[PDB]
Design a protein around this nucleic acid. Structure first.
Ligand SMILES: [Ca+2]
Ligand SMILES: [Ca+2]
Ligand SMILES: [Ca+2]
Ligand SMILES: [Ca+2]
Ligand SMILES: [Zn+2]
Ligand SMILES: [Zn+2]
Ligand SMILES: [Zn+2]
Ligand SMILES: [Zn+2]
Lengths: 478, 478
DNA sequence: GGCCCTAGAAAGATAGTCTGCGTAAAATTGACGCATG
DNA sequence: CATGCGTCAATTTTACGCAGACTATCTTTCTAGGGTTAAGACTGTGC
DNA sequence: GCACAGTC
DNA sequence: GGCCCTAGAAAGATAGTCTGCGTAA
DNA sequence: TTACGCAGACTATCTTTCTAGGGTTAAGACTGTGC
DNA sequence: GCACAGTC
């Protein structure tokens, strides 16, 4: 059935359309509506001004563009009051002011507060639920997974208050929001996923290991693909349940040594030499264990990947070798995210989810992009370049309108005019001059607060001056 | 004797000098001459050019300036081939090119290769050692310690080859060079420290826990201070043997539950109600244990002469309260370092040590600086501004000389000219005479038929002129 | 609502700076005729 | 042609009122992040 | 029949 | 060198561009 | 009063190693209790 | 008188 982006999004060769595939217009439109609803409350009558207006689609895309660049650079835990510090960079200030950015980041909302009282008792995830579901839906519809899938967990660090955040001791960040997800091995496309949501998890009888494998697998349950799992999800009853009609999937993964189903023959005695392995069968399933170290034993379960052999080049059972090759399907995605991620400090947990969705979209967008382009036969650029182009495609239309203000400073105006593509169908000069070519109004060496107009410029440095200081040439020129 | 900078570094209000106190000429001179020795071995006749040149002190300081800014901007990754990408920023570009930076950093050496081969069987740390000892020496000499000191260890991440590389679980970074360290409490000034250097460390009878506390505390050995330390070091024989003619220091810290030092009355945790505590006296010193949780007990040792009882505001024994306040003296230093660290990927372990020394010099310089400024009675700026000022003080002389080349591009010339604080005219205080009095009264460039009043005096020749002929400057002046 | 601890960033507000435009007083400054040589 | 005096309404240069948009910097609240006596949630076995 | 200690 | 895996930066080298001074048309 | 060589510094981009970083069967090195 | 398994 092949692997790759589906027919619907196949002939796309640029980073913005590949991004819109995951976000869509419905998500951006919902963000704009609810954000405005919130902004309208946080506007006491002292706040009338440019920085405290409302939002639209162009601004939200530009905002995302800033988050995309934030991920490219490592400035994601850097103060916003430094990011927008001119002289270090004109990259962020050219899109919007630091105050507009701060106001908006505090006001983005993904839901309708008026209906919370009928949702919150049943769904602790309410404030991000509509967006999450639309997002995951897009992910599934844009791509056809290959032969092997990997299921594992991802933690979005977040130490603020959150009803379902949980501690995990062995992670880089230990106290955030747990998300379970499925990715295809070898490509790292995120296919599916869902929040853990604490102690809700209303499974019925089914333990969580099995429950989540069966739910995450839903899109692909009608055909045969493999599943690589952790020991949190791998078990004997799951290996057998997945082979019943409603699922055609099979499973490979390690198991815990304390499970009841493992025979004593595969347990670690001290008479068993180091480096040996043994196989036994539980019917259709093959259970294998081996001891790489004098006091350590590892167990693996493999269902449809049947038969048994040892790879003489390493001495390892072939089943573990297979496992080692597919087990990285989900953590590789996380590794790509930690290298290029935009996740900022915040005291509102639904933002943790929004930042996570932006990072996932950037990876999935890249995968589709890369695939479509290499299929066409053109060279594919790295993620770093994809992201730089994504930045411009998301912010250019906003910067273009920002320029309409007759009073948009000068240095902002000059930088925007030389950042934009200038993809104008037929633009040309009339007399070698730029289409704006305006002189500054005020005197270079005078305080701006006095608004003293400059009627002349310095021949030797082309600066605007007032007669009180100079007329033909400036005092700084000589 | 109080706490604070010593007599020699008592009145420094300039950040650059505060930095130089921990490097001095001996470290810079050794680095630059050994680096030149290395550069000459990396040349090929085909490489003759401006990039592959010998270093000098100004470049080395500028180079450290880049590393200081690197820490401010968190550019500890970020390929240098991106950091020096004009249009994102000119902050590094204006100091040196990316290829000069890559060549220079690659060639830095802190030692003499012709001597090393006869030193290496005795000291595995040879390639760093000379600089290291100079560095620590200055760290000890400046800044008198306070009444509370803390001893713990820090790990310099490094996964490359290193003979004494250590793996430590439960860390931010699993592998690296372990540094034993002593820091002042309250003010996190790094006083002393030393590499672990492998299992070959030779001690005589004394365990390492005990050994390191005695060596780290040497410079304060004859004064009474209260050392707070981890359970890797805390023990009865350490506590008993630090209150003798030599060594007059006390120890406070947690202990392991398996030491046969702890009586069975404390080593219980079964009949004891949760939240209660018990303690006893062994002699000069005391041991307390308490049971914060129904399945967990903690033991603490104090060799201070005290019975501090229980703090009623929490119910915790006062020894615990004390411990919690001073235990953070070393890890807080590591936290400050990781928030603004200058470190880069490298395959040469001595660089890991150099990067470590840069971060410590930056924090210790800040502490001396902060102290002197608040003592004077002036406001102290945060570390972020301190680092920005340090950057300019280290890179300015270099940039000033870089401008000497007639061919130093145009954008480099302009970005450098507008960042240098002293790029000013030799401006006078006043001007004795310009209009003079009434020399002509008519324009000397005007016909007798016009009799135009001369409304101006030539700026550079004081001639009687009409603005039409001589705008401000005369035609004979320019 | 959520283990001890810290440094420093977001949360949230207030006072100030950099750009454009328009009009009216102020600011000249460029001819205007009366002499000398 | 080179100078000289005292006159004016053209010219130009301020002064500042009509704002709009963006920015530096302050205090207070509270996450990000090191650290271990310290944090969840799960499965499967002893009393 | 409970609540008890071992791993993500 | 010294667990499994990957993605992407640093090693390390090559070919090319932006800048002024001396040549005159 | 505008073009061309010549030499000096800086710049983009390529391919081959091999560390930063994510895991979990996996990584040290010290201290005190098993035969 | 030797070899093993618990915490940074
Ligand atoms: Ca702000
Ligand atoms: Ca896992
Ligand atoms: Ca390079
Ligand atoms: Ca410690
Ligand atoms: Zn002026
Ligand atoms: Zn000028
Ligand atoms: Zn004239
Ligand atoms: Zn003149």
């Amino acid at each position: 059935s092949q692997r790759g982006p589906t027919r619907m999004c196949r002939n796309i060769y640029d980073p913005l359309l590949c991004f819109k595939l995951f976000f869509t217009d419905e998500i951006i439109s919902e963000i704009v509506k609810w954000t405005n609803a919130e902004i309208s409350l946080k506007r006491r009558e002292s706040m009338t001004g440019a920085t405290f207006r409302d939002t639209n689609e162009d601004e939200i895309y530009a905002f995302f563009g800033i988050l995309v660049m934030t991920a490219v650079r490592k400035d994601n835990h850097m103060s916003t009051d430094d990011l927008f510090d001119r002289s270090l960079s004109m990259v962020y200030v050219s899109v919007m002011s630091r105050d507009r950015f701060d106001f908006l980041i505090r006001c983005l909302r993904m839901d309708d507060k008026s209906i919370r009282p009928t949702l919150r008792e049943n769904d602790v995830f309410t404030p991000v639920r509509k967006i999450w579901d639309l997002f995951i839906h897009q992910c599934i519809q844009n791509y056809t997974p290959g032969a092997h899938l990997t299921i594992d967990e991802q933690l979005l660090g977040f130490r603020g208050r959150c009803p379902f955040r949980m501690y995990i001791p062995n992670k880089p960040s230990k106290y955030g929001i747990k998300i379970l997800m499925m990715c295809d091995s070898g490509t790292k496309y995120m296919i599916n996923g869902m929040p853990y949501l604490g102690r809700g998890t209303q499974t019925n009888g089914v333990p969580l290991g099995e429950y989540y494998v069966k739910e995450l697998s839903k899109p692909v349950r009608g055909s045969c693909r493999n599943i690589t799992c952790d020991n949190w999800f791998t078990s004997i009853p799951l290996a057998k349940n997945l082979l019943q009609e409603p699922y055609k999937l099979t499973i490979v993964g390690t198991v815990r040594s304390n499970k009841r189903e493992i025979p004593e023959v595969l347990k670690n005695s001290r008479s068993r030499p180091v480096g040996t392995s043994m196989f036994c069968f539980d019917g259709p399933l093959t259970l294998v264990s081996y001891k790489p170290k004098p006091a350590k034993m590892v167990y693996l379960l493999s269902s449809c990947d049947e038969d048994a052999s040892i790879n003489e080049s390493t001495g390892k059972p072939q089943m573990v070798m297979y496992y080692n090759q597919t087990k990285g399907g989900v953590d590789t995605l996380d590794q790509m995210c930690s290298v290029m991620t935009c996740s900022r400090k915040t005291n509102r947990w639904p933002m943790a989810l929004l930042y996570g969705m932006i990072n996932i979209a950037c990876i999935n967008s890249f995968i589709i992009y890369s695939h479509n382009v290499s299929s066409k036969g053109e060279k594919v650029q790295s993620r770093k370049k994809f992201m730089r182009n994504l930045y411009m495609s998301l912010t250019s239309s906003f910067m273009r309108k920002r320029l309409e203000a007759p009073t948009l400073k000068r240095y902002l105006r000059d930088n925007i005019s030389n950042i934009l593509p200038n993809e104008v169908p037929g633009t040309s000069d009339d007399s070698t001059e730029e289409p704006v070519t305006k002189k500054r109004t005020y005197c270079t060496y005078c305080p701006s607060k006095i608004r003293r107009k400059a009627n002349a410029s310095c021949k030797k440095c082309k600066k605007v001056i007032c007669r009180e200081h100079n007329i033909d040439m400036c005092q700084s020129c000589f």
